[PDB]
Design a protein around this nucleic acid. Structure first.
Ligand SMILES: [Mg+2]
Ligand SMILES: [Mg+2]
Ligand SMILES: [Mg+2]
Ligand SMILES: [Mg+2]
Ligand SMILES: [Mg+2]
Ligand SMILES: [Mg+2]
Ligand SMILES: [Mg+2]
Ligand SMILES: [Mg+2]
Ligand SMILES: [Mg+2]
Ligand SMILES: [Mg+2]
Ligand SMILES: [Mg+2]
Ligand SMILES: [Mg+2]
Ligand SMILES: [Mg+2]
Ligand SMILES: [Mg+2]
Ligand SMILES: [Mg+2]
Ligand SMILES: [Mg+2]
Ligand SMILES: [Mg+2]
Ligand SMILES: [Mg+2]
Ligand SMILES: [Mg+2]
Ligand SMILES: [Mg+2]
Ligand SMILES: [Mg+2]
Ligand SMILES: [Mg+2]
Ligand SMILES: [Mg+2]
Ligand SMILES: [Mg+2]
Ligand SMILES: [Mg+2]
Ligand SMILES: [Mg+2]
Ligand SMILES: [Mg+2]
Ligand SMILES: [Mg+2]
Ligand SMILES: [Mg+2]
Ligand SMILES: [Mg+2]
Ligand SMILES: [Mg+2]
Ligand SMILES: [Mg+2]
Ligand SMILES: [Mg+2]
Ligand SMILES: [Mg+2]
Ligand SMILES: [Mg+2]
Ligand SMILES: [Mg+2]
Ligand SMILES: [Mg+2]
Ligand SMILES: [Mg+2]
Ligand SMILES: [Mg+2]
Lengths: 185, 222, 148, 58, 49, 51, 127
RNA sequence: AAUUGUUGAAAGGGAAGGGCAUUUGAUCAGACAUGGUGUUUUGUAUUUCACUGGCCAGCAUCAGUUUUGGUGGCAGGAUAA
RNA sequence: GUCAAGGAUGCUGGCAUAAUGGUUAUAUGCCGCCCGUCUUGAAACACGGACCAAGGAGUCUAACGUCUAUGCGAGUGUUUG
RNA sequence: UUGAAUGAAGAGCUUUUAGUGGGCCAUUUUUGGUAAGCAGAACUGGCGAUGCGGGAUGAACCGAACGUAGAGUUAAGGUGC
RNA sequence: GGGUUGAUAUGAUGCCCUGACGAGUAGGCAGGCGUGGAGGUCAGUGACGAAGCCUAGACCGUAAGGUCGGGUCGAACGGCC
């Protein structure tokens, strides 16, 4: 008999491997497991953790987001590392020359990077040209910009986007949504 | 290789230097224990000769053993037992006696037997039941190197320095005592005495303050 | 895949995951959206406020092709020029050869000014524009022409 | 049918299963409820401070 | 009943709808029938297009 | 692999604690005290034997 | 002879028979956990049958090993049999139940030629 | 399969069945080979040949955990009374 | 170099098979109330169950929520044709 | 020794959904009652959901909570049989 | 919680080191066992006997179950992804 102060046999609650059956992603996890164990640079631990992430935890990083990251002071010649998908952005009309190391590139993103004299890199070419993650810049896409996150924590006076199928007048704009009909939220 | 032979010779020389340090520290500790004991005895004799009474210094350290099991404990004494790391029956901890811990002991009095440990029972507890906490992972002590690797920043290089920080409640008593995992004691080898355990020691039971009689019980449990 | 359902894990267990007390029954709270004003008011208010009642004018015989007006912001606007003709227009930002962007033929009814076209003049043929979209196009050096 | 009306038995145990959580105080609290005359001024004092700091830094 | 935070659905299945389910298993067969009829018609209305 | 016990196993009692050899050589745990001749006061003795 | 193994400890040699399988013929001896609310076997009263749990698990060094010290590999023909050419001290062949009498002869002869142990070298033997 | 007959075995003082453990009866699986220096050898190289591994133990020297004795040296107190 | 120092080795005996062990029946010691179920509470003097074989109960669909895997990604969905 | 002691088993956060929404007992404080194995509250600990050792027997008492085993030691209770 | 890649070593949902823990209804989740049929595969088993069925005969698995021997039998049926 032991007076337990915690839950016994509690899992860590973190992914220790990707849920995917992608053999190439398992190869990348094998390489960055070696590089997290044997290098003791914190980049490799971060990249190994980020390789486990799900599709909603790997939002796409736009090329405009990459260019805004290179507009930082002294970050213009770093290697932008996106553990995920790099997507195109037609809203930006001037993309610089840079090295981007990502899992996937869309065709427009790859064309926009290599049109400006840049270079698109996989995460193992990054591992051979920056094994401690020297001169790198990890970028992450926006997580709370997802459409599902609008409805999270829905309640009174939270302003959190009702789960609705059709949107308009007659569709939840009445008693409970204005002073005149009933009350306001 | 020859460089590996150089590292082996360097390691053995460093080990001899560390053992010389530990040996002279243990000799100094034995000398100060002997002189403090003789000084208290002669202070009592001198006060009896002068006609006065030497009031001994109040005890700075208790050893606390949880004697009552897991079920049917109220939440406040249960929380105090968890904060004193007595999470199972016959678990012992060293507790620094101040007012902030005497009112913990008063709260968990019906569930523990505590008293004032001597150097002999501290030495036997740390020698036989002495385990560390290293990556929390309960490492058996067994070697002065794993005490130097964790308590060496506080100047503790050996199991005797660790014992010294307990018996003389040192500046780093908290760190040494929290390095010590709670002592998993057995049931006492000659019984408890006491046909029923859960009355006070004054009333013929086991719990409560057992001032200098905790050494007999803990040596039976060890 | 019937084998991956938890019915096959509930084989052998009596209540099938539904309870010995609660005892899965037919329709214990009503059927459908029953009792949204009475015994599901705490669910209708809180997660669906506004479900009950009327809001404004009824529209008899609405045709949604009257209201067809898809909006194109100015931060796109150059995606309507094809990808290989686009760069030779971006360089040599010139009047007397300015790209005509028929936006109705691309399928938009209103131009909005969400932001930052380059400083190249364009002819923008559009059914409707907003004020800031017009100001930004004339600031870049072009003109909006209205069509129908 | 006569039965138990109300009891607070087990409620403190359930309350302390997932702990009793303190409300996680922040630097820069919300100005909800603070005096509007103070708020309208403080917006301008902050705007002028940031303007003067940008002028002194550049 | 109405339950947890979920959108309000308007599934119009409160009639005897199972008497009127038209499943188009015959999509491929009617495609071959349409092509056969076009070939047959073209042979009937030779050279006319 | 196995926790050998000091307070048995003099090899482990000498691996830990290099002073155990000196303690066992000088006997150091059976050492005689100096015979002082302090006599208690009559006030202490008559308070002790006092009714 | 096999590889040297530790002494095989089984920890529960008795078969885990179902409750009341001795009492009703409809209840077979195949183990079913009693999920009843008042079940003495489920509640583990003293005097009742033991239930299978993971503490009875065999030692991993001596698990799946026959008393000879071999794992049994089921063999249907000679091509199955010669998978154990380099694993004779670890694996023992065992001819499947549906193999002919005339094919068991050549399986047994090839296994003797390879040194592979057969655990049933007596099925369908003409005597 | 329920149910039944015969034969064989077994047990049986107001149930029977079951758990742990062993006695008794019945019944059954598993292992001696091995590498080996050695030629008293026949079909002249086949082979001449005490080793080895299976089951149960006895003692000795140890290690771990304990239990039960014998005995020695110190310390304290009203430096016992 | 040795050792009792990061976990047993040395020497010897008998047997080499029902001897150890397995299964099985029985006997003995102690324990063991009939399961399912509703229940605050079941061995209940609560309900179902005489026994056996076969059959027998969270399925499919429309529209969705969360999560996850995949493809492409400001796009995306070939399969109405 | 960065502003008391002790502990910290990682801390913080989010989504989603099952069951449940008949309770009951015990020490102490209590209301209605003459009282209850009555009806009703407060705090805690239990039973429900839980076996084990003891109270001969019993849901709640006492001791103690449970993987499979070996050895030791005990708790509550006992030691004429 | 860690260790392990310039034959780790070709099992890196591997091997290994270290420490703690293990009760459970309703319920949740995970890893597996079995069944009818389908794609692939073993150039799988089989009239020299497939499946079935009987078997206080044997083996493996904590278990779901799997495997084998004997009898009966007579035309088909398994392993793995
Ligand atoms: Mg004893
Ligand atoms: Mg089941
Ligand atoms: Mg269950
Ligand atoms: Mg039910
Ligand atoms: Mg119109
Ligand atoms: Mg160990
Ligand atoms: Mg078995
Ligand atoms: Mg079994
Ligand atoms: Mg069964
Ligand atoms: Mg019950
Ligand atoms: Mg029959
Ligand atoms: Mg009679
Ligand atoms: Mg010994
Ligand atoms: Mg035999
Ligand atoms: Mg026997
Ligand atoms: Mg009985
Ligand atoms: Mg209930
Ligand atoms: Mg019952
Ligand atoms: Mg009946
Ligand atoms: Mg019936
Ligand atoms: Mg059936
Ligand atoms: Mg309710
Ligand atoms: Mg109620
Ligand atoms: Mg109910
Ligand atoms: Mg009253
Ligand atoms: Mg129960
Ligand atoms: Mg009991
Ligand atoms: Mg008792
Ligand atoms: Mg009684
Ligand atoms: Mg009695
Ligand atoms: Mg009590
Ligand atoms: Mg015992
Ligand atoms: Mg469990
Ligand atoms: Mg099939
Ligand atoms: Mg064939
Ligand atoms: Mg057959
Ligand atoms: Mg039978
Ligand atoms: Mg036929
Ligand atoms: Mg089959």
């Amino acid at each position: 008999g032991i007076d337990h102060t915690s839950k016994q046999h509690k899992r860590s609650g973190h992914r220790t491997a990707p849920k995917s059956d992608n053999v190439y992603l398992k190869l990348l996890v094998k390489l960055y497991t070696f590089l997290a164990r044997r290098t003791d640079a914190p980049f490799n631990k971060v990249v190994l953790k980020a390789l486990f992430l799900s599709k909603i935890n790997r939002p796409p990083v736009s090329v405009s987001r990459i260019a805004r990251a290179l507009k930082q002071e002294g970050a213009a010649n770093k290697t932008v590392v996106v553990v995920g998908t790099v997507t195109d952005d037609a809203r930006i009309f001037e993309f610089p020359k840079t090295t981007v190391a990502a899992l996937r590139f869309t065709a427009g993103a790859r064309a926009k990077i290599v049109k400006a004299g840049g270079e698109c890199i996989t995460l193992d070419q990054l591992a051979v040209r920056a094994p401690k993650g020297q001169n790198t810049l990890i970028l992450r896409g926006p997580r709370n910009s997802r459409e599902a996150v609008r409805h999270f924590g829905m309640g009174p006076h939270k302003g959190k986007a009702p789960r609705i199928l059709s949107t308009g007048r007659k569709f939840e704009r009445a008693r409970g949504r204005r002073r005149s009909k009933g009350f306001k939220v | 290789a020859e460089q590996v032979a150089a590292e082996r010779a360097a390691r053995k020389a460093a080990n001899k230097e560390k053992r010389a340090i530990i040996l002279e520290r243990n000799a100094a500790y034995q000398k100060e224990y002997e002189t403090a004991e003789r000084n208290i005895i002669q202070a009592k004799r001198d006060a009896k000769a002068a006609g006065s009474y030497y009031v001994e210094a109040q005890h700075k350290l208790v050893f606390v053993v949880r004697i009552k099991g897991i079920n049917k404990i109220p939440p406040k004494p249960r929380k105090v037992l968890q904060l004193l790391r007595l999470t199972r029956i016959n678990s012992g901890t060293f507790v620094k006696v101040t007012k902030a811990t005497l009112e913990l002991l008063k709260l968990i009095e019906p569930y523990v037997a505590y008293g004032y440990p001597s150097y002999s029972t501290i030495r036997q507890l740390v020698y036989k039941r002495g385990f560390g906490k290293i990556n929390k992972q309960r490492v058996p002590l067994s070697d002065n190197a794993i005490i130097e690797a964790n308590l060496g920043k506080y100047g503790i290089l050996s199991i005797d320095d660790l014992i010294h920080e307990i018996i003389t409640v040192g500046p780093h008593f908290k760190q040494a005592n929290n390095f010590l995992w709670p002592f998993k004691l057995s049931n006492p080898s000659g019984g408890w005495g006491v046909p029923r355990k859960f009355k006070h020691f004054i009333q013929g039971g086991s719990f409560g303050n057992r001032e200098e009689f905790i050494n007999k019980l803990v040596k039976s449990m060890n | 895949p019937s084998r991956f359902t938890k019915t096959r894990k509930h084989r052998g267990h009596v209540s099938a995951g539904k309870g010995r007390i609660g005892k899965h029954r037919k329709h214990p709270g009503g059927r459908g959206m029953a009792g949204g004003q009475h015994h599901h008011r705490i669910n209708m208010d809180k997660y669906h406020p506004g479900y009950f009642g009327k809001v404004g004018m009824r529209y008899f015989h609405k045709q949604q092709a009257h209201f067809w007006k898809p909006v194109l912001n100015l931060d796109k606007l150059w995606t309507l020029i094809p990808e290989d003709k686009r760069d030779q227009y971006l360089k040599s930002a010139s009047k007397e050869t300015a790209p005509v962007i028929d936006t109705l033929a691309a399928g938009y009814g209103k131009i909005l000014g969400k932001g930052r076209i380059p400083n190249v003049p364009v002819i923008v043929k559009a059914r409707f524009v907003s004020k800031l979209a017009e100001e930004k196009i004339r600031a870049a050096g072009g003109v909006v022409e209205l069509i129908a | 049918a006569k039965s138990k009306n109300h009891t607070a038995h087990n409620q403190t145990r359930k309350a302390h299963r997932n702990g009793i959580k303190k409300p996680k105080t922040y630097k820069y609290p919300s100005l909800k409820g603070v005096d509007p005359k103070f708020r309208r001024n403080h917006k301008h004092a902050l705007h002028g401070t940031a303007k003067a700091l940008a002028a002194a830094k550049k | 009943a109405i339950s947890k935070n979920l959108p309000i659905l308007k599934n119009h299945f409160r009639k005897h709808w199972q008497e009127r389910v038209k499943v188009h298993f015959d999509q491929a067969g009617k495609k071959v029938s349409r092509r056969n009829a076009r070939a047959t018609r073209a042979a009937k209305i030779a050279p006319r297009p | 692999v196995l926790k050998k016990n000091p307070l048995k196993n003099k090899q482990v009692l000498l691996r830990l604690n290099p002073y155990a050899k000196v303690f066992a050589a000088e006997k150091l745990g059976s050492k005689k005290a100096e015979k002082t001749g302090t006599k208690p006061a009559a006030v202490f003795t008559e308070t002790l034997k006092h009714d | 002879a096999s590889l040297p193994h530790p002494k095989i400890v089984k920890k529960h040699t008795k078969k885990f028979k179902r409750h009341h399988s001795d009492r009703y013929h409809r209840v077979a001896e195949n183990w079913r956990k009693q999920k009843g609310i008042d079940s003495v076997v489920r509640r583990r009263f003293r005097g009742n049958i033991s239930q299978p749990k993971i503490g009875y698990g065999s030692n991993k060094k001596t698990k799946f090993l026959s008393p000879s010290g071999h794992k049994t590999f089921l063999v249907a023909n000679v091509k199955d049999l010669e998978t154990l050419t380099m694993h004779t001290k670890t694996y023992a062949a065992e001819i499947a139940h549906n193999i002919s009498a005339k094919n068991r002869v050549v399986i047994l002869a090839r296994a003797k030629a390879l040194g592979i142990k057969v655990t049933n070298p007596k099925g369908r033997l003409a005597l």
